[PDB]
């Protein structure tokens, strides 16, 4: 019974939506915490004016470290900050003023319970009066060739409000300095940070040190979770400490690997079972297999006899093809020919099926849903919206000519098919030329 | 809590223009004393001084109409940056000049009702400023062309300047209609010399230089004139930050933010050593800070990538040499991988490393057609703006190629 | 496309109705006017339509039958031999139309 | 906390993984969870099988593939939200707001925080499962739409009593690989292996097909005596058993397709039930063979044509695979496309090959093949055949010209 009170303190903790005095900060992030924090409370505290842009990858911890800051300062200067919050994804060039028109109030409502839309801003908070901070994810979509009005306001602000003002943007491109328009280029105040990357195997044992343990006495068992996990991380040959220096190794982004680890401490029943699934660690392999269930060979495992076959066929027509192109007769003209030479190496006896040009129809069907085929300049998904609506207005001739002369080409190569095919299939010996 | 403010809070608080200033003014005298209507052009770099020596040239023309030496006029200020619209122009100019609120369209006819049939003693002067004027562009450069050409009225008695990024730009882009009526009267500005940076650096910190301070011990708060203390910024320091700034660019915003980096390095150097007599700041802070501006985090997140990136890389390049081409299949480069392990293939290791790459070190996973976290690399790489990739749904013929130079890339492989 | 097709479907329903523009129209048509629904669609000629949109849209048809009060009739016109429309649809919609269809010859050369 | 969980077959670890990353606690379940795999996997019918066991979890459930484009999803949302808000939550003093309002986005985040701030009076934090089923199956899609669904629920003021929870289903691999570097919870739906399939037909569609009409006839008519509901489910199994046997190489391991088949021959296969035919399913087999033997899932002298349309169809399928090389001598590439040709020559070779002259019969048969679309053209809208652009190619099968080609004696068989 008791248990539960652990095993939902590990969740509560990986999640990351702790309270600030129980909040974590990574080792190798600190120096870039320290640097953002300093001009956060030089902004809000002593009433500075700055302009940030943090750098590096989707799912760095960058916006993580602001709402850190954040939660730290409302405990003591709640009253003296207005924070602005716009997603490149959401807004807009045109909804974007909308929401901070919107968010001024909301949080002036809760405080008191584009010419001149800036200039009345600065003159109602004048009024009013706070520090007002504005916060930008996928700067480099408001830093698109479409005019950069929003920033180019916003960076210009910096160094003429009369309200103290501060800015942090956040992307993932590095050549941010080029997004921006040389306008705009110039009016930021160009203190660029860039998120500090895991480097060593020695920063992520300690990124999951940090994670994992637990600092109060919430349950009679934490002492023994934080001894087995120091353990775990101690010894090299630890199956998790295994599977850690190969997720090191692979790819650099920790969230990837605590996403990975949440369903085993989700999962474990009992502290028992918790124990011995962290010490035998093979639910993080059929995790792994299942992340890897839907890809090219998980597909080809699944199929029939017969969609393998006219498979086969089609991947020897594509070869033999100077382009690669193939059509659905050629796929059934060498399907006879293979089962006929089949056939044919059968003695005939003294006094196996070709399907049907129709019934094979459903199999090339199943085969072009399943993504082995696609269709000749097949662009598949489209971008945005723009280029979906042109994409919907066309008619492709591929769409309108017969079923038996759309032009395919192909996903997996013979060389591939002899890789994962079995050699106990019968076809199997077709997958040479 | 009091705002705490240390001995180098002055430096980052806190002449070069007159020539351009009497041009500008001497065009202006002379039409809006006569009563007459014409087009002012202004050109140049950001950050060169352009639209404070506007401002400045219009503040003295108030003070000349205040001496009533020229005769009352009225000012309107308008960025091309800052509105929402195009067709706002129209409505706010019509707004200032009128006090009314009707729509562009009626705004603009408005405007030309206006300038063109009033008689010119039922007016008072006008002068626009019409900043980011090549932003303001659209299909047909109606307000390129409608603004100047009201200039033309001699019954207009309006002034109209206009910023923009280049001199030539109606002999560039505007047509010869447009072009005629702009004219002659254009003025450009230049960026500016190291010695004009260290000038007005001098010039915004003339009373701070070798100056005392009263400071507080306790928490490092310091009154300009507890114990006294001094304060120094390096010439030598002004005069490396103003060489290089000047060798980079014009904008004056550059030098000023140099200047605020290197006294908030010296603050920070100074809190560190007293954990809350002459405080020199020092050609290293000023260095600092053009290391930062010069350096590209490029190489070192590179050599920062994981092994699969390092390994993509890797392949990429091994193919850009075999083939003399810019761009790879990852028909190319998924098997030239393999080829890359394989030929290593004697090696114990490569064992293990394929067992990682291939099965991700388990028996009950098999072969992949990819290495593992393929799609993670290659849309990570494509997230940094490193690589960069065409859009088509096969998985193969699907093309692939570097975004940053080849020489950085060798470069980063080399260290690994 | 489909996109147009449902629009313009849902365009004459509601006129049909209000003479006594989504799906949301065919679940709330009882709630609004108190009857029950049946609906005739007339492909008024078959070899003409693009296969792959009335493909789709016969789909996005076979959504309407979870609700109790909806009932669908469709009326295919064919010039050439029925095997033609086989070769353009999808197998998957052909089972749909192969439950419960009527085949009829109208054509004035019946048997001199 | 704790969420029971369902037994269902087949889908076990993916039920393990959606008793993970759900549950009443919003501080312990995801911002977005992602379930994919392709139709016929069971998503749908797993996920409503999951909230089917929990009630208290406040789940609203969408289809984009009713909803045709963006702006029925995004209004569906509020519409939906805010009326199980009410059904749940009903002493609450609320106003209504109207979906129709939802225009944008950002309109959502707005109706969704006025909502939100509405219910503020709530004591406890709690979970609102929005769910979309087939968010790829949206018709009007592109790339960058699901972002805006990813990245939501953060603009959203972390204060509120009611947070959202978002949960997709997916279809296509190529859409999950643009967005993993997110690192999105993720569950996998594999295809069902054939003895997965068989199970689940069995224990689906057994019963219902067990009682219906045609046996309520069939075992009155053979005046069955000592019939039992055990025999008549061993009956009605083996008939989903043969079926898969036959046709599994055929519809591949789709339950759909196997569904169908089924519906198409169980009353001829109930048909051929007897007295001696139960209790030996061997012989069942043995007499209703040729069920097993063709597929039955076809629609349904095939062509019947005059003799001038027949030879304007046998000519214009010689000018759509003959090379115009040959026509100066001949008369004097199966696999592929046919090629396009002009009238010009489709003329002459009727001409040529009939056993005719201009008269208005010949033209009028050539429009009555376009008209059943025998004979394609190179447009789609604005027919205009008469405007020289136009080019004609052959729709029409060489299985269909050769049995012309027998029926008007010709001998196209020696042209080529
Ligand atoms: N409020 C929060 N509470 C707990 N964890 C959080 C919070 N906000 C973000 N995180 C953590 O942040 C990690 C991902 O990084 P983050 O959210 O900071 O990047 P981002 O803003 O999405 O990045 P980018 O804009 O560069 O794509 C996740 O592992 C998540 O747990
Ligand atoms: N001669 C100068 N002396 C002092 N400060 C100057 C001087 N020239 C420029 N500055 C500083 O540069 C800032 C920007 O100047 P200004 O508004 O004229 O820009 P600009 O040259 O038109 O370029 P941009 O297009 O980037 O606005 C001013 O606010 C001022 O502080
Ligand atoms: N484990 C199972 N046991 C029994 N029946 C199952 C099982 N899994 C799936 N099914 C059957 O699968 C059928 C198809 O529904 P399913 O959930 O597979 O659709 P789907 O893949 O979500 O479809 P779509 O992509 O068209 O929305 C259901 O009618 C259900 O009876």
Redesign the interface.
């Given at each position: 019974p008791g248990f539960?009170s652990l095993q939902?303190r590990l969740?509560?903790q990986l999640?990351g939506?702790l309270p600030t005095d129980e909040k974590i900060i990574f080792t190798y992030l600190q120096d870039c915490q320290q640097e953002i924090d300093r001009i956060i409370k030089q902004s809000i505290?002593?009433?500075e004016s700055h302009s940030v842009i943090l750098?590096g990858?989707?799912?760095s911890y960058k916006?993580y470290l602001l709402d850190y800051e954040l939660s730290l300062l409302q405990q003591s200067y709640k009253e003296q900050f207005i924070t602005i919050?716009l997603?490149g994804?959401?807004?807009?060039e045109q909804?974007a003023?909308?929401?901070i028109a919107?968010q001024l109030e909301?949080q002036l409502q809760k405080i008191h319970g584009?010419?001149e839309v800036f200039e009345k801003i600065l003159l109602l908070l004048d009024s009013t009066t706070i520090t007002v901070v504005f916060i930008f994810?996928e700067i480099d979509t408001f830093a698109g060739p479409v005019?950069?009005?929003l920033l180019?306001?916003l960076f210009d602000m910096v160094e003429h409000s009369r309200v103290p003002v501060c800015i942090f943007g956040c992307t993932?491109?590095?050549?941010i300095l080029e997004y921006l328009e040389?306008?705009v280029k110039?009016?930021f105040?160009?203190?660029?940070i860039?998120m500090p990357?895991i480097?060593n195997l020695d920063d992520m044992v300690d990124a999951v040190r940090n994670l994992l343990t637990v600092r109060s006495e919430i349950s009679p068992w934490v002492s023994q979770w934080n001894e087995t996990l120091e353990k775990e991380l101690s010894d090299p040959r630890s199956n998790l400490n295994?599977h850690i220096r190969?997720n090191?190794?692979?790819?650099?982004?920790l969230?990837?690997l605590?996403?990975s680890i949440?369903?085993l401490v989700?999962?474990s029943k009992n502290f028992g079972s918790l124990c011995t699934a962290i010490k035998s660690c093979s639910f993080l392999?059929?995790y792994?297999?299942?992340?890897?269930?839907?890809?090219?060979?998980?597909?080809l495992?699944?199929?029939?006899?017969?969609?393998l076959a006219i498979l086969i066929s089609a991947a020897r027509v594509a070869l033999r093809a100077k382009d690669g192109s193939f059509?659905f007769?050629?796929a059934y003209?060498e399907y006879e020919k293979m089962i006929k030479a089949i056939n044919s190496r059968i003695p005939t006896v003294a006094p196996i099926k070709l399907?049907l040009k129709?019934?094979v129809?459903?199999?090339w069907?199943?085969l072009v849903?399943?993504?082995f085929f696609?269709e000749k300049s097949?662009?598949?998904?489209?971008?945005?919206?723009t280029?979906?609506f042109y994409a919907?207005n066309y008619?492709f001739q591929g769409?309108?000519?017969?079923?038996?002369?759309r032009?395919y080409?192909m996903?997996?190569?013979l060389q591939?098919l002899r890789?994962?095919i079995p050699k106990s299939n019968m076809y199997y010996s077709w997958t040479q030329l | 809590h009091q705002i705490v403010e240390t001995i180098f809070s002055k430096v980052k608080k806190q002449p070069a223009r007159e020539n351009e200033f009497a041009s500008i003014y001497l065009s202006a005298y002379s039409a809006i004393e006569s009563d007459s209507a014409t087009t002012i052009y202004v050109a140049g770099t950001p950050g060169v001084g352009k639209t404070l020596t506007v401002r400045e040239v219009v503040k003295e023309l108030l003070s000349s109409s205040a001496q009533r030496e020229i005769p009352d006029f009225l000012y309107v200020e308008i960025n091309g940056l800052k509105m929402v619209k195009p067709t706002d122009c129209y409505e706010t100019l019509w707004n200032k000049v009128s006090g009314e609120r009707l729509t562009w369209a009626a705004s603009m006819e408005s405007l030309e009702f206006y300038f063109k049939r009033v008689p010119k003693n039922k007016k008072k002067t006008i002068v626009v400023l019409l900043d980011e004027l090549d932003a303001m562009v659209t299909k047909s450069q109606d307000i390129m062309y409608n603004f100047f050409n009201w200039t033309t009225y001699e019954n207009a008695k309006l002034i109209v300047i206009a910023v923009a990024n280049t001199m030539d730009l109606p002999e560039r882009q505007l047509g010869n209609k447009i072009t005629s009526r702009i004219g002659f009267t254009r003025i450009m500005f230049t960026g500016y010399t190291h010695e004009e940076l260290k000038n007005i650096i001098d010039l915004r910190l003339k009373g701070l230089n070798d100056s005392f301070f009263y400071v507080d011990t306790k928490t490092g708060n310091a009154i300009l004139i507890v114990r006294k203390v001094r304060l120094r910024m390096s010439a030598d320091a002004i005069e490396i930050a103003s060489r290089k700034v000047a060798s980079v660019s014009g904008d004056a915003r550059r030098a000023l933010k140099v200047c605020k980096r290197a006294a908030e390095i010296a603050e920070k150097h100074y809190m560190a050593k007293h954990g809350y007599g002459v405080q020199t700041v020092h050609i290293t802070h000023v260095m600092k800070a053009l290391n930062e501006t010069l350096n590209s985090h490029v190489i070192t997140f590179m050599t920062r990538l994981s092994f699969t990136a390092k390994l993509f890389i890797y392949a990429l390049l091994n193919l850009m040499k075999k083939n003399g081409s810019q761009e790879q299949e990852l028909g190319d480069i998924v098997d030239e991988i393999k080829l890359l392990i394989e030929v290593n293939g004697s090696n114990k290791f490569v064992m293990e490393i394929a067992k990682t790459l291939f099965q991700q070190g388990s028996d009950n996973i098999s072969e992949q057609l990819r290495i593992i976290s393929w799609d993670f690399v290659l849309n990570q790489l494509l997230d940094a703006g490193i690589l960069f990739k065409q859009t088509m749904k096969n998985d193969r013929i699907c093309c692939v190629k570097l975004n940053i130079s080849v020489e950085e890339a060798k470069r980063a492989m080399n260290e690994d | 496309n489909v996109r147009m097709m449902l629009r313009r479907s849902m365009y004459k329903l509601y006129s049909a109705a209000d003479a006594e523009y989504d799906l949301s129209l065919v679940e709330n048509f009882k709630r609004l006017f108190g009857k029950d629904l049946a609906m005739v669609f007339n492909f008024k000629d078959v070899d003409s339509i693009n296969f792959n949109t009335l493909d789709n849209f016969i789909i996005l048809l076979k959504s309407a039958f979870k609700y109790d009060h909806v009932k669908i009739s469709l009326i295919f016109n064919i010039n050439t031999n029925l095997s033609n429309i086989e070769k353009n649809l999808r197998q998957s919609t052909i089972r749909l139309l192969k439950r419960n269809y009527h085949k009829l010859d109208v054509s004035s050369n019946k048997g001199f | 906390m704790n969420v029971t969980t369902p037994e269902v077959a087949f889908r076990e670890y993916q039920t393990n993984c959606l008793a993970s990353y759900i549950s009443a606690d919003p501080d312990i379940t995801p911002s977005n969870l992602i379930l994919q795999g392709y139709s016929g996997t069971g998503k749908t019918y797993t996920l409503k099988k999951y909230f089917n066991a929990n009630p208290n979890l406040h789940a609203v459930w969408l289809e984009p593939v009713e909803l045709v484009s963006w702006k029925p999803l995004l209004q569906a949302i509020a519409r939906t939200v805010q009326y199980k808000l009410k059904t749940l939550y009903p002493n609450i003093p609320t106003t209504d707001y109207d979906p129709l309002q939802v225009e944008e986005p950002f309109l959502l985040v707005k109706t969704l925080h006025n909502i939100f701030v509405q219910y503020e009076s709530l004591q406890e934090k709690t979970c609102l499962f929005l769910i979309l089923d087939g968010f790829d199956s949206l018709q009007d899609l592109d790339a960058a739409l699901f972002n805006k669904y990813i990245k939501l629920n953060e603009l959203l003021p972390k204060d509120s009593k009611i947070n959202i929870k978002f949960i997709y289903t997916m279809l296509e691999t190529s859409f999950l690989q643009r967005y993993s570097t997110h690192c999105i919870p993720t569950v996998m739906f594999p295809r069902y292996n054939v003895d997965e399939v068989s199970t689940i037909l069995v224990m689906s569609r057994c019963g219902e097909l067990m009682e219906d009409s045609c046996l309520r006839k069939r075992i009155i008519e053979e005046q069955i005596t000592d019939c039992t509901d055990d025999q008549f489910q061993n009956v009605a199994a083996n008939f989903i058993h043969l079926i898969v046997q036959a046709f599994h190489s055929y519809t591949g391991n789709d339950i759909f397709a196997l569904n169908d088949l089924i519906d198409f021959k169980w009353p001829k296969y109930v048909s051929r039930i007897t007295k001696e035919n139960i209790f030996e399913p061997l012989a069942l087999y043995k007499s209703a063979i040729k069920l097993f033997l063709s597929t039955d899932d076809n629609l349904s002298q095939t062509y019947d044509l005059s003799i001038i349309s027949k030879y304007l169809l046998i000519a214009s399928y010689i000018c759509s695979y003959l090379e115009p090389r040959y026509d100066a001598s001949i008369f004097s590439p199966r696999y592929l496309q046919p090629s396009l040709f002009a009238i010009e020559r489709l003329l002459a070779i009727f001409q040529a090959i009939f056993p005719m002259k201009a008269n208005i019969e010949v033209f009028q048969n050539l429009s009555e093949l376009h008209t059943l679309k025998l004979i394609a053209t190179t447009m789609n809208k604005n027919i205009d055949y008469l405007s020289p652009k136009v080019r004609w190619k052959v729709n029409v099968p060489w299985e269909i010209i050769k049995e012309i080609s027998e029926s008007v004696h010709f001998n196209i068989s020696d042209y080529f």
């Open positions: 539960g939902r969740l509560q999640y939506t505290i002593q009433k750098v990858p989707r799912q916006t919050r997603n994804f959401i807004h807009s909804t003023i909308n929401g919107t909301q584009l010419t994810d005019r950069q009005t180019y306001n993932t491109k590095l050549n040389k306008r110039s009016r105040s160009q203190r660029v860039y990357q480097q295994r190969m090191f190794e692979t790819f650099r982004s969230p990837t605590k996403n949440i369903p989700a999962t392999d059929i792994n297999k299942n992340q890897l269930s839907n890809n090219l060979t998980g597909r495992q699944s199929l029939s006899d017969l969609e059509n007769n050629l003209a399907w129709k019934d129809k459903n199999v069907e199943n849903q399943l993504d696609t097949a662009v598949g998904l489209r971008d945005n919206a280029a979906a919907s008619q769409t309108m000519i017969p079923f038996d002369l032009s080409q996903q997996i190569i591939e890789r994962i | - | - | -």
